[PDB]
Every structure is written in C-alpha cells, then in structure tokens.
Amino acid sequence: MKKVSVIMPTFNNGEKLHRTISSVLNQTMKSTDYELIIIDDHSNDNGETLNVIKKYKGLVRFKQLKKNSGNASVPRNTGLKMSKAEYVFFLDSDDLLHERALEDLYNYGKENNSDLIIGKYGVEGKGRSVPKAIFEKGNVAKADIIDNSIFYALSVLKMFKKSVIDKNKIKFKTFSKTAEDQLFTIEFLMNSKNYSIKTDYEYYIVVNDSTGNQYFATINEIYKAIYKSPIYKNQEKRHQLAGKYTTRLLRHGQKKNFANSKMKYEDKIEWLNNFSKTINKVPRDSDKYVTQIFNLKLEAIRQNDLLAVMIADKLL
Amino acid sequence: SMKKVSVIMPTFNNGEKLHRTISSVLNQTMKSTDYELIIIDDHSNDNGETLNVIKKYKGLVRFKQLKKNSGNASVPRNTGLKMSKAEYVFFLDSDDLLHERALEDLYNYGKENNSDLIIGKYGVEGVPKAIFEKGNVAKADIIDNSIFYALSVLKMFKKSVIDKNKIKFKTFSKTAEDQLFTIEFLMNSKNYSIKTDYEYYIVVNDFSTGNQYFATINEIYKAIYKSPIYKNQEKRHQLAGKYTTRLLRHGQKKNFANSKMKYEDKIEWLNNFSKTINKVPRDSDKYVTQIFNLKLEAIRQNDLLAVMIADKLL
Amino acid sequence: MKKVSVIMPTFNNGEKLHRTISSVLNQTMKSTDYELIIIDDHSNDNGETLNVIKKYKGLVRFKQLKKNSGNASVPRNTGLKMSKAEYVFFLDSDDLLHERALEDLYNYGKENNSDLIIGKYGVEGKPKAIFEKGNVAKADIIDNSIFYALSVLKMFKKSVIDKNKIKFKTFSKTAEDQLFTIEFLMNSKNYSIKTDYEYYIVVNDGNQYFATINEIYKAIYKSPIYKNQEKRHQLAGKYTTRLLRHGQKKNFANSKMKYEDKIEWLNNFSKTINKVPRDSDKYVTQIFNLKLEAIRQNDLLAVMIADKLL
Ligand SMILES: CC(=O)N[C@H]1[C@@H](OP(=O)(O)OP(=O)(O)OC[C@H]2O[C@@H](n3ccc(=O)[nH]c3=O)[C@H](O)[C@@H]2O)O[C@H](CO)[C@@H](O)[C@@H]1O
Ligand SMILES: CC(=O)N[C@H]1[C@@H](OP(=O)(O)OP(=O)(O)OC[C@H]2O[C@@H](n3ccc(=O)[nH]c3=O)[C@H](O)[C@@H]2O)O[C@H](CO)[C@@H](O)[C@@H]1O
Ligand SMILES: CC(=O)N[C@H]1[C@@H](OP(=O)(O)OP(=O)(O)OC[C@H]2O[C@@H](n3ccc(=O)[nH]c3=O)[C@H](O)[C@@H]2O)O[C@H](CO)[C@@H](O)[C@@H]1O
C-alpha cells in the first residue's frame, strides 16, 4: 500500500506537462512510497499530450477516458477508484509541487493522525491570489474550520485520507461547471475530525496563465452536507457552520455584485430567483452567524427583491 | 370636609424598604388631616413582611389587600381610584419618594390656576427634562411644554375629570398603559400646570409580539381623535403627528429592524406597528420631524427591508 | 418671401415691452428681409399692453386672440400659420435680441443648409454645454448636448415645420416646448450652433406631463431620420438621462407632496417609461441605475431611497 497517490487529470496540456510531471517525480519521498496517477480527459491535441505521458511509461500509472468530460470531476473520480493508497493528493496538470511536498505533508499527517493536510500555496504569475488567512498562524496540528478560516480555502489541492473518501462514498459531482471542488472538500470536512496545516514551505505552486441553475444546485448540496454532518451533529453548530459559509458566499461567490452590474435585467431576475430559492432552504437560525454588515443583502436575497439587493450593494 | 389629595400607592413584595416611601408621604408640609394615603397591596406573598410594614401605620393610612396578584399597578390603582373622594389624586409607586413639600406645593399651585393636572419635577436616586426647563408653568400646552415626553402617571390629577369621563387604567397590556391613562386625561381636560421649585417626586432606580403594546398605542391615537377638548380636526392631526414623532424617538424596540430579533418576530412587530399607524390619518405625517420621512413611510408600507434601509440611513 | 419671421406672444407685459420690440426692430439684418409677428394672448391689463403694441402700427404684424389660452402654445401656432418666411424665430416677450442675431444666425444657416440654428444665450438678472466648443456647422444631438437646450428660442426652417405639420400641443402646460424641438430634431438632419455673441438675452424677473414625455419617446422611435433601431435606443436612453437630471418634479419622492399625489405621479411616470425599451437603459448614466429601475417597478419607497443615495 502506497503512502500517497497523486491524482492528476490532463487535457490538451502538450509539452508544458513535462514540468508538472517532473515536479512530482523529483520528490524527497521514496519513489516506491508513492505513485502518480495521470487520467487524460480524452485530449484532442494531435496526440501531443498523450505522447508526453507515454515518455514516463513504467514510472506513472495512466488511463485515458473514451470521451472528454469537460472538467476535473470524472478524471479525478477515475483516479480515486484506481488508488489503494493511504492518502490521495489532487494536483492540477498546470501546477507544481515543492520537492518536499509529499514527504512533509504525509509525515505531519501521520504524526497528527490527520484526515486532511493543507500545505501553504505559492503562486507563479500575476492573476488569481491564493488563500492566506488559513496559513497566518503557522503550523496547526488540529485546525478548526472557523478559527483557521478553512471555508476560504476549499480547493481540493490538498492531501486527503483515502479511507474517509471510501467509507463515505465521496465523489466529485458532475452536473455543474463551478463549485464542485468546494462541495467535495466540504463533504470531506463534514465527515472527518482531524485537519492539519503545514506552512514551512510553499508546498503547492498555483500557476496563473450562466443563469446559476447548476451553480446554485451545487451550493444547495454544500448546505445539505453541513446539515447532515455526522461529525458536527449539534444543531446549533450546523447553524453556525452554515452562517459562516453564507458569509464566505457573500464575500467571494460567483457574480457576487451582479445586482448593479451590466447584466440584462431578465438575467438578473433569473440569477436572483435561483439564489433566493437556494438560500430559502437554509434555516434562518443560521443568519445570526453571518457577518452583520451583510444583514440587509442576505435578507434582500431571501425576499427575492432585486431593488433591495441593488440598494444593499450601494450601502456596502 | 373632603380631602384635598389622595395618594394612591400599590404595593407588592416591597418588604422593610417600604417604610421609607410611606414615611415620605406621612411627613408632608400639608396638614395631615387634609390628605390620605391609600395603600393597595397586590397580594404580597413575602412571608408577611410587606403586610407587617403596612400594619405599623395602621390608623394613619387606608388599606385594601387584593386577594390575588394582578401582576402590575393597573388593578390596584383602579381600586385606589374607587376608594378616593378627594379633590385630587396623586399616584406614588411603592419604591419612590415624595419631597416633604410635594402635596402642599402642587395642590396650592393647582388650586391657584384651576388646574386639572399638576406635574412636579422628577429627581432620581441612582427622568424627563424638556418639560421642566422653563420654570413654573401655570397654563402649559402639550406640544410647547413637551408633555408627550413625560407621560407617567406620577402626577396630581383632578378626581372630577377621572370620575366624569370614567377614566381607568387598562388591564389588557403590560406596557404603555400608564401613557394611555395620562393621554386620556389630557384629552379630557384643558388646564395643566408644571411645578419645578423642588425635585418633588424622587425616582429610585434599582439594580414580545407587540400585540398588547400596539393595542395601547392604538388607544392613544383614538383618544386624540375623539377628544371633546381638542375637537378641531387639524389640531387632532397635529397632536397625532407629534405623538408619532415621540414614538419614533423613544418608542419600544425603536431599532427592531436591524436588531437580533428573529425574522418571524420582526414581521409580527412590524405588522402590528403598520396596522396601528395605518389607522392614523396621513394628514398627521406633515407634523412628524422630516428626518423620519422614509422610516414612517416604510412602516406604513409594512416593508421590513425598507425599515432596515431607513434605519441604516439615519 | 422674408428671411425671418420673429414670432412674439404677449400677455400683460406693459411698458417694459418697448425694450423687447425695439431689440427686434434694431437688427443689423436688412429691415425688409424680416418681420415681427406679435400674437397677443388676450391681454387684460386695462389696455396697457395693447397701447404699447399700437405705437408700432405699421411696423409689425399683429393678431389678438379672442381669449387667453394660458401659455405660448396657441399664439405660437397662430404665428406659424401667419408666417410664409424661410425661417421662424421664437422670441419671448420679456427677452431681448442682440442686434446681430437674425443676420448672423441666418447667414450661418444659409451657408450650412441648416434646418435649425441655435444662438448662444445671455442673461439679465440674478444651457451651457452646447456652446462650449464654439461654432458647429453640423451638430450631433448627443455630442453637442442638444437634449439639454430644448427651448424653441432658436431659428427653425419653416418648410420642415410645414411639411411635417409640427405644432405646439395645447393639452400640456409643461414640456410642450421640448416636444416641439424634439419632433423637429427627429424630422431634420442639419443643426448649427452659433456662439460669436450672446445672441438671445433671457431676462429673469402628471397625467398631461407624462402624456407629453410619452410623445417625446414616440417621436424618437418613429424617426424617419434616425431609422436604425440601436440608434433609437441610444437617443431614448440619452433623453432618459436628461429627464432624470432636469425633469419636472425630479425630486418628488422625498418632497412635501401628498402621498396620494406621489403615487399618481409615479404611476404616470412608470407607465410612460415602461413603454420605452429596456435596450435604452444601458445608455443611461450609471448613477441613475437604481432610480430608473425603481420607476420601472413603480416602487415609491425605492425611488425615495434612490434619491437619498444620490
Ligand atoms: C483559482 C481557482 O479557482 N482555481 C481552480 C480552477 O483552476 P484552473 O482554472 O487553473 O483549472 P485548470 O485549467 O488547472 O484545470 C483543472 C484540472 O482539470 C483538468 N481538466 C480540464 C479540462 C477538462 O476537460 N478536463 C480536465 O480534466 C485540467 O487538466 C486540470 O488538471 O479550477 C480547478 C478545477 O476545478 C481547481 O482545481 C482550481 O482550484
Ligand atoms: C422608568 C419607568 O418606566 N418607570 C415606570 C415603571 O416603574 P418601575 O419599573 O420602577 O415599576 P415599580 O416596580 O415601581 O412598580 C410600579 C408599581 O406597581 C406595583 N406593583 C408591581 C407588581 C405587581 O404585581 N403589582 C403591583 O401593584 C409596585 O408595587 C409599584 O407600586 O413602571 C411603573 C408602573 O407602570 C411606572 O409608574 C413608572 O413610571
Ligand atoms: C427658464 C425657462 O424655462 N424659460 C421658459 C419659460 O419662460 P418664462 O417662464 O420666462 O415665460 P415667459 O414669461 O417668457 O412667457 C413665455 C411666453 O408666453 C407668453 N404667454 C404667457 C402667458 C399667456 O397666458 N400666454 C402667453 O402667450 C409670454 O408673453 C411669453 O412670450 O417658458 C417659456 C414658454 O414655455 C419658454 O420659452 C422659456 O424657455
């Protein structure tokens, strides 16, 4: 049994993929103690990506899917079924591991009996920032969702204990183009107790290059996961987690400032209708846990009142 | 010889503390024989302590015990009103104190000015202010002398006004019923006096749906609009508008909309507020201070989001 | 056929009317090339105004209406019927012309085949953007801020008015001047701006209104000049901005107006704007986004709030 399976979906990466693969093959961890599983989402780039992957045959595991699934969910699911390792680690095909990543995160996980180990993110190139608050206290052996700001760091680019994923049948959902990764991490968090944060190096380097129907169905599943948590079973604790998530959603959600945007009126109405429908399935008891500057915006969404959202946004 | 003044004092589980309040009444500059203290005990159950105190003034006070606890001052004060045949009554709460000159100074001033109502300045151990800023006022006015801001019943009232108009404390509300008594009295009389030479009444400080509260507020507006004294309809609008301003400034839970109250309770509160103000003619709104323009409209529209916004813009 | 008819409605002006009439009669333009048409709206000032007009017997054309119409519309329509000139110029009876006004505006119009010539306004006592660039031979409604200078105190080519039967509306005591100018603009192509002097000196001492505004949007959307649907959206949206910036009772919502009157006003406003395509909304200045939506939604509270945030 391997200590770690790195699961990397690929799609039309071509020759750029060498760099990412090299970052995985040059780990300080013993080569026999881990594997890289590459799942190619039926690249169509005149054989370029597949030709790159074939240069590592015998050093990696590899499967190609019959048709392109359109995002990381199915390829990542395919990888989970292939791994019988202790931990998995999701790596995107454009990012880079620090050479110490697998060894340090695994060791720290083992030491602290962690279900989830989060390594500090670095960045290559201007663009999207990476989470910062989660890493501001240094290393944390047993982290808290709320105190360590985990709802602001919900990518799957982390080390997850495989047995939690297996026992709880946790899979990536395939019906939405956005927030699926948040849902997977939340489902994991709600079924596990022990989370660790490792900050000694920048272990994972992020490289930078709708009507809301599907999106708000995904958000609905996040709230459902919280309210069914077997770990966080106290009802008031669920309200608190749900309120903290609502705060995160209002702070960083898709099209968060749609109301005063250049979106067509008809599209605003449909967007807000979906948003309102989803939030109205969340108990109002969670609302007292939302940061209070958002009190009006949140009520306006509940009331499905576009004028009131517009006004709330002018006052924020 | 009818008494000049009946002091009406409800009691409930005061204990030894009560001596001080009784003594403040029994030591007056007014001739002892010209006033009486009527004590109505609201079924104390403090191991006989309150009753033992009252028993020490047997023969110096009139006393009635109620056989079940009413739960507030209304039923005891009404009992007191039935018992008094005096020219004026004065409501004293069982934890407060009268200045030794209170009955004589207020009664004499009332007699000199043919006053229906005399208001003595309040002091505090551990109260309204604008009403008392102008010195003594022989013939005061509700709006000009800020009387809507001093509506407690801890005042001297002419008994004939209470009797003729059958004015009683309501017992359907645990809040604002005192304001209603004073409003009903003001709406049925003309001559009000303010006396400030001394802190005549000393307040001792110690360490919901809206259904009843707003039922009481409803009765205040109905008193104004049915006044046999203030009969002119524009004067009614002015008084109602001035009351509305007082309510928005100092009313219960005035900032409910952005508060920590549960949503269902906000909706019930505002439904109550909205339906009550919507019975008040919009002609009164021009008399409300302009800063409240949006908040008052939002309340009339029964629109919680608008009330939230109005409060954020204030 | 005269070059210019100056059309001047009068009503209870009195002795001060002398100063105005002589500003017309002392033009640099050849005396026989222009005419002053005075239309008295049945003055009732004990003959004072009439007595002034009478002194110019033989130097002006004059018609008195049998009854006071209440405003300039009917008298101006009367003036239009009486004039067979190349151009008309509307002059209010309390205002003044610069001696160079008719000559300079006409020559500039003739030079540039203008349908409309706008002279720079001056003031006596206690629109600007249109004049800030100096003379413009062929102006653009949007770029030269014409929607902000919609008075009829300008030189208009008579044939345009005749051929399109353009008349002042009598059923609105407000905004009828705007509608005239807009109907003219939407049925003509060549507009000129002249700025060498302050040519025209202004002296300073909802059912019908929104019916008029409705006609403004209809004039734009049925324009035989501006036939492209997107251009029509652009013009409508720019007009919406002008309406929100300078419209009658623009701040009605937080005003001392009776609630019932606020509701009726907004209801008319809402009804009118909801006949205007939402495609026009993107061309409205972004600060008005909330106010404009509040009006479309017929939501008085939202209009009150919108005003407080402007
Ligand atoms: C800043 C941010 O929000 N980043 C997120 C974004 O990254 P980002 O926008 O960089 O997504 P990438 O392009 O890196 O794609 C993510 C992974 O999906 C694979 N892929 C892509 C297309 C396809 O049809 N099939 C397929 O398997 C890629 O090869 C890659 O391994 O989306 C990723 C996928 O949810 C998340 O992990 C990242 O956290
Ligand atoms: C700052 C303020 O808002 N003060 C008011 C408040 O005073 P406060 O909160 O101090 O009320 P008190 O405790 O004085 O009680 C009022 C009177 O009611 C009596 N009592 C109490 C309980 C009971 O079951 N039965 C009974 O008769 C008390 O003995 C006392 O005589 O409420 C009083 C009663 O409306 C008003 O007169 C005061 O103006
Ligand atoms: C600053 C401003 O917005 N000024 C406008 C305002 O001028 P203002 O408010 O100054 O109106 P005036 O007093 O100039 O009257 C306009 C003209 O109408 C005539 N009149 C008046 C009363 C009457 O019953 N019948 C009649 O024909 C006047 O004599 C005058 O010739 O209204 C005029 C007519 O809409 C517009 O041309 C002006 O641009």
Ligand SMILES: [Cl-]
């Ligand atoms: Cl993250």
Ligand SMILES: [Cl-]
């Ligand atoms: Cl999101």
Ligand SMILES: [Cl-]
């Ligand atoms: Cl005395």
Ligand SMILES: [Cl-]
């Ligand atoms: Cl008064």
Ligand SMILES: [Cl-]
């Ligand atoms: Cl008081």
Ligand SMILES: [Cl-]
């Ligand atoms: Cl209540």
Ligand SMILES: [Cl-]
């Ligand atoms: Cl009256």
Ligand SMILES: [Cl-]
């Ligand atoms: Cl109150």
Ligand SMILES: [Cl-]
């Ligand atoms: Cl007043």
Ligand SMILES: [Cl-]
């Ligand atoms: Cl206007």
Ligand SMILES: [Mg+2]
């Ligand atoms: Mg004595």
Ligand SMILES: [Mn+2]
């Ligand atoms: Mn990436």
Ligand SMILES: [Mn+2]
């Ligand atoms: Mn990329």
Ligand SMILES: [Mn+2]
């Ligand atoms: Mn609303």
Ligand SMILES: [Mn+2]
């Ligand atoms: Mn008390």
Ligand SMILES: [Mn+2]
């Ligand atoms: Mn007390």
